Amino acid sequence: DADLAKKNNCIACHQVETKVVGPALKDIAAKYADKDDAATYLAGKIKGGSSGVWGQIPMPPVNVSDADAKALADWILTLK
Numbered sequence: 001d002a003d004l005a006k007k008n009n010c011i012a013c014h015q016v017e018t019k020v021v022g023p024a025l026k027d028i029a030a031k032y033a034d035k036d037d038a039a040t041y042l043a044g045k046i047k048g049g050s051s052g053v054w055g056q057i058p059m060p061p062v063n064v065s066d067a068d069a070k071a072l073a074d075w076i077l078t079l080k
């Protein structure tokens, strides 16, 4: 949820509705709305890092547990 993201400093780089440093959360929700295994694909990007999908700034890997990574991915998916 929104609190889980704030506590893990997602929000320092992401807004729900707008681009700050990382893509807007809702744009991520929409890009992967169709996508198979979207949630596990996202969980993996959240824990492992990301580079090149949205622009030149890389996202550093974030130290969350598997369970939090999954809940944050499932949550972003609902921001459609």
Ligand code: HEC
Binding pocket: 005, 008, 009, 010, 011, 012, 013, 014, 021, 022, 023, 028, 042, 045, 046, 050, 051, 052, 053, 054, 055, 056, 057, 058, 059, 060, 062, 064, 072, 073, 076
């Ligand atoms: C700034 C230092 C960041 C913090 C802290 C978090 N994220 Fe991020 N994110 C950031 C950038 C610069 C990018 C784009 C990277 C790229 O590939 O171009 C991203 C991207 C994501 C994505 C989408 C990945 C994809 O393959 O499409 C997700 C789902 C995402 N970020 C989520 C996320 C969460 C849940 C965070 C809290 C733990 C978080 N990010 C931290 C920048 C930064």
